[PDB]
Write a protein that binds this DNA or RNA. Structure first.
Lengths: 505, 528, 23
DNA sequence: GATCCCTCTAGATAT
DNA sequence: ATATCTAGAGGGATC
């Protein structure tokens, strides 16, 4: 669903084995897991601050939950992430943080997985929001938690099966173990994955924790159709489609106004009244005006809306045009994505697929008239077929559908000053070709980050977490002048000698 | 800058005859002139427009010396157009009964544009002639006319009822007034007009002879009087040692209405009686009032809110070194998909004005990119305070100019990571062979391009990029109707707008049987 | 689902940018 | 109805 | 000084 949230519970073991270390340089599993949770918290705050995150420790001497099961400490309940929780978790980070954790919560006590999963299920059920995903990340480094005791282990498998039945996804995030984690000894029948893709013993720990520690700051907006329009062939063959924005300029979050002292959000209200009595001007005793130098033209608001009305919302198929007639330099505004919808007109997907297949075969594009909503002048757009593309890992790099390209009107193009064409001799072209070949690189869409947005995120993190000095974002859009100077060498001098006269700047 | 335009319209009796089913040439010329003057007035351009009518019953022109230049009247002298001119164009001007040679009218327009511009400064002088060429003429002053145009630097445009080269639809795409209808006198007039355009500009002058129907769906009337954009000077840098002086213009930039709707009182029709204010109230109960000086800006961070003052933000803001246009590297053109273009403008990059070395260097770069089939990834910052962008500069070579076209590329945060269900692999939405053949026939029938014979050139039957934005003309029509008759509802959308917004009738006629087959082969039911 | 992000289920995992790396 | 998102409109304001 | 960045009223999607 759309309104559904994502619920994540970090299950961190507090056994003594987690507090050991095989090397001084290496990090003990406990603080590594704490850093994992911190990275997840920061990434979620930047991205999906509407989700729910909780942290539960099992194996402690002290108990804290809604059931009073022993050796279960719920540090945080299912709630939106915040800076206070991040700092509270930081209190245990690293050396002397492990000591603080051991001093304020016990460790090394005996536990029971069934009770732990019971506590997690109660945590999931207690909150009243609607969620799409109920995930649990278990941080542990013991292959058989209840290897010695059979009854507790069996109850654990039963409880895990129950949680799988009710829809709780159970992941496994094993840390480093000197003897190898040896997955599939106990955890095989409980983890929600379809199967253990690797049935090795996993001497190492960095299975997927590197993905968690890898911080990528982006909003990650949920999927939602901009408009659920109707593609009409002539006037009767009407299919239902949806318009999405696969690319949209990421904006800096808008600042909010709050009270000077209490630091609480302040609601803004706008009111309009005449300056003769103060009585509010209801939107039925005012009119729109335009003075064109000496004459005033007066129109009702309804008339101003009406003069912009051409067609009903939807796409009117004008025809089919070969793709070679769509010029690359006639770009107007970011293109959209058209994908069929079966919720309104049953049978739209079949016709949409047939149109997509035939347009791909014939290398044509459906030229249509686009009216996004009522009282909006239409534009001319091209639905370019877009075949599904999968990489070597079989992931959807490019979804199948249509690409809605906006075609500029006659007055969206500007006349340009006449310039005499001065062509270059083949020697200069060859030298510049050598220069171009020197600086060749492979380009990907996700290769550059917005320096402004990254710096804003770093500044916000530093302000909220009370950091001593904000981390400076690395600007990847800055040319590596030293690198290309070393790469080119004397090519630039030769090119300037060939082209630039000896008295030019 | 400011330009002086003279509209020489034909009014005589032969311009009023009409073949049934086709609008009279007088009405079409009136529509074109109305569109031109509407755009000039409601955009508040400073161009001065005259209006000379030839073929009228009366005679009022400076050259009316007796038994010469008769039946020609200068209806409107050179001045700023106003709503009055639109009023005469729409209602006052009536077709005449006499005839006049269009060369005499051209000479009269010459005199109007000559002995009415002294003192005033005009960058361009333009004359637009609307006529049917059905009147006898004398080619006795042709050389003098051509020399006068050449010396005085005055342009020319000709509009005719028939294009130079099913039912006739005004402003639509397709056939116009039949090519056989042109009479011998019209043929002679057309050949004289063609020779005049050739001797005036050259082979391209043939492109300045339009038809009323095709003029109503183009910006040809404003082509010679439009002001070009201003250049943005910078330096293309490849490293810290190579720099090319460049000037970048905006090619594609969406045009929006410049004038804003002013909110006024419905009783006094004045704006000072209406003003807008905002009241700041705490979200808590009792809605206490807070002044502007008692509010400090803050930011949202998860479930917490952190105060971040404007001064602190300005000191903490990402500081850019300033204006820059720097090449980050070169990549294969196939790696820059057209679907990733961002921003709301397209920049065409030339070398610096009258700079030979910069032109040679930029042409070298453009040809190097074209030969290797590569594009340049550049970092573009318009100003010191502007947010830096990353974009693609790909070569654009034509028969008369070369340039680099810049379109902004997305950042990693502008990409959306949704996933969509596969369509080809679906076993429930798989069309059968009959449905595929039906769609194939439908696509064949609704083709918008004509594969021309004897040459490998594709002709565009529906060139939408040359169609003006209908919203501006519709708004101008509504405004003019309200100004002239402020007691009536808004008029319906003009028929030629619908004609120019619709595909040619051949496409619709050829796609009836395939569309019926699609309807009978794809069961579509609207869910309740 | 392959390539699905662990932090945000239902979305694709964002890989590090990397910038410009000459061959 | 409420909340978020996205054009659109209108205004403000340094290079 | 035009343009850009920033800032405010609206229309659907989705509960």
């Amino acid at each position: 669903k759309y309104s559904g949230r994502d619920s994540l519970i970090f299950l961190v073991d507090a056994s003594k084995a987690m507090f050991e270390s095989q090397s001084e340089d290496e990090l003990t599993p406990f603080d590594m897991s704490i850093q994992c949770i911190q990275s997840v918290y920061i990434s979620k705050i930047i991205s999906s601050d509407r989700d729910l995150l909780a942290v539960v420790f099992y194996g402690t001497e002290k108990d804290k939950n809604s059931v009073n099961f022993k050796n279960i400490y719920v540090l945080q309940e299912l709630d939106n992430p915040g800076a206070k929780r991040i700092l509270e978790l930081d209190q245990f980070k690293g050396q002397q943080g492990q000591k603080r954790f051991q001093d304020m919560m016990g460790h090394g006590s005996d536990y029971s997985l069934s009770e732990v999963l019971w506590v997690c299920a109660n945590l999931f059920s207690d909150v009243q929001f609607k969620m799409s995903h109920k995930r649990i990340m278990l941080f542990t480094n013991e292959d058989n938690p209840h290897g010695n005791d059979s009854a507790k282990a069996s109850r654990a498998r039963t409880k895990a099966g129950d949680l799988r039945d009710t829809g709780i996804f159970l992941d496994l995030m094993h840390l480093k173990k000197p003897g190898g984690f040896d997955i599939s000894l106990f955890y095989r029948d409980i983890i929600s994955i379809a199967e253990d893709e690797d049935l090795r013993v996993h001497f190492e720990e960095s299975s997927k924790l590197e993905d968690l520690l890898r911080k990528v700051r982006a909003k990650e907006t949920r999927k939602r159709a901009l408009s659920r329009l109707k593609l009409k062939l002539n006037k009767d063959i009407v299919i239902s489609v949806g318009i999405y924005n696969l690319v949209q300029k990421a904006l800096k979050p808008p600042p909010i106004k709050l009270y000077r002292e209490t630091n609480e959000p302040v609601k803004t209200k706008t009111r309009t009244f005449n300056t003769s009595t103060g009585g509010l001007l209801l939107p039925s005793d005012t009119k729109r005006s335009q003075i064109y130098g000496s004459r005033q033209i007066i129109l009702e608001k309804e008339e101003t809306e009406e003069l912009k009305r051409f067609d009903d919302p939807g796409l009117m198929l004008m025809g089919f045009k070969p793709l070679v007639l769509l010029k690359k330099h006639h770009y107007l505004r970011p293109s959209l994505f058209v994908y069929p919808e079966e919720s309104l007109v049953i049978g739209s997907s079949t016709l949409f697929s047939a149109l997509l297949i035939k347009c791909l075969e014939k290398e044509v594009a459906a030229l249509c008239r686009y009216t996004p909503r009522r009282n909006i002048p239409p534009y001319f757009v091209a639905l370019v077929p877009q075949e599904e593309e999968l990489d070597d890992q079989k992931i959807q790099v490019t979804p199948p559908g249509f690409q809605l390209v906006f075609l500029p009107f006659a007055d969206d193009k500007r006349k340009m000053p006449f310039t005499e064409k001065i062509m270059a001799t083949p020697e200069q072209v060859g030298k510049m070709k050598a220069i171009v070949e020197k600086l060749r690189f492979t380009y990907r869409s996700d290769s550059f980050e917005n320096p402004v947005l990254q710096q804003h995120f770093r500044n916000l993190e530093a302000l909220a977490l009370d950091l001593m000095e904000p981390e400076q974002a690395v600007d990847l859009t800055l040319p590596k002048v030293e690198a290309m100077n070393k790469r080119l060498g004397s090519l630039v001098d030769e090119f300037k000698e060939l082209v630039y006269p000896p008295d030019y700047n | 800058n400011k330009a002086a335009v003279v509209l020489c319209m034909d009014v005589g009796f032969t311009m009023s005859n009409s073949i049934p089913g086709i609008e009279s040439p007088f009405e079409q010329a009136k529509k074109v002139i109305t569109m031109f003057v509407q755009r000039q007035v409601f955009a508040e351009n400073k161009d001065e427009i005259a209006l000379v009518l030839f073929g009228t019953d009366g005679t009022d022109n400076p050259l009316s010396g007796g038994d010469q230049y008769q039946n020609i009247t200068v209806h409107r002298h050179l001045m700023l157009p106003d709503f009055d001119l639109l009023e005469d164009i729409e209602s006052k001007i009536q077709p005449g009964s006499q005839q006049a040679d269009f060369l005499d009218a051209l000479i009269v327009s010459m005199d109007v544009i000559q002995h009415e511009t002294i003192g005033k400064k005009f960058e361009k002088r333009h004359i637009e002639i609307f006529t049917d060429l059905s009147s006898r003429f004398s080619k006795s002053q042709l050389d003098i006319i051509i020399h006068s145009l050449k010396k005085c630097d005055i342009s020319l445009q000709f509009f005719l009822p028939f294009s130079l080269g099913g039912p006739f639809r005004l402003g639509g795409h397709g056939p116009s007034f039949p090519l056989k209808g042109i009479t011998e006198q019209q043929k002679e007039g057309l050949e004289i007009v063609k020779m005049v355009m050739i001797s005036l500009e050259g082979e391209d002058g043939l492109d300045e002879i339009y038809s009323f129907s095709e003029s109503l769906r183009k910006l040809c009337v404003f082509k010679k009087i439009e002001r070009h954009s201003i250049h943005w000077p910078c330096r293309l840098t490849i490293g810290s040692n190579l720099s090319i002086r460049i000037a970048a213009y905006k090619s594609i930039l969406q045009e929006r209405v410049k004038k804003t709707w002013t909110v006024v009182d419905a009783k006094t029709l004045k704006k000072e009686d209406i003003q807008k204010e905002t009241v700041y109230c705490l979200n808590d109960d009792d809605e206490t009032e807070v002044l502007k000086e008692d509010i400090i800006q803050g930011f949202r961070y998860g479930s917490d809110i952190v105060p971040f003052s404007k001064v602190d933000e300005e000191q903490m803001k990402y500081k850019s070194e300033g204006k820059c246009f720097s090449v980050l590297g070169f990549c294969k053109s196939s790696q820059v998909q057209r679907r990733f273009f961002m921003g709301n403008q397209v920049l065409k990059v030339f070398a610096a004005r009258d700079d030979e070395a910069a032109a040679v260097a930029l042409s070298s770069l453009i040809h190097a990119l074209d030969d290797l089939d590569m594009v340049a990834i550049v970092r573009y910052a318009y100003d010191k305070r502007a947010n830096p962008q990353v974009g693609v500069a790909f070569p654009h070579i034509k028969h008369n100019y070369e340039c680099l076209v810049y379109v902004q590329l997305p950042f990693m945060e502008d990409l959306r990571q949704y996933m969509f269900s596969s369509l080809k692999n679906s076993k429930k939405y798989a069309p059968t062979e009959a449905q595929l053949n039906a769609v194939d026939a439908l696509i064949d029938s609704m083709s918008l391009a004509k594969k021309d014979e004897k040459t490998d050139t594709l002709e565009d039957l529906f060139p939408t990029t040359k169609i003006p934005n209908p919203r501006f003309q519709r708004l101008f029509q509504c405004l003019l109707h309200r100004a002239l008759h402020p007691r009536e509802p808004l008029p319906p959308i003009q028929q030629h707008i619908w004609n120019m917004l619709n595909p040619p009738a051949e496409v619709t006629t050829k796609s009836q049987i395939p569309l019926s087959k699609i309807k009978t082969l794809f069961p579509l039911i609207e869910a309740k | 689902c392959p390539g699905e992000s662990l932090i945000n289920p239902g979305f694709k995992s964002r890989k590090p940018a990397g910038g410009v790396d000459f061959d």
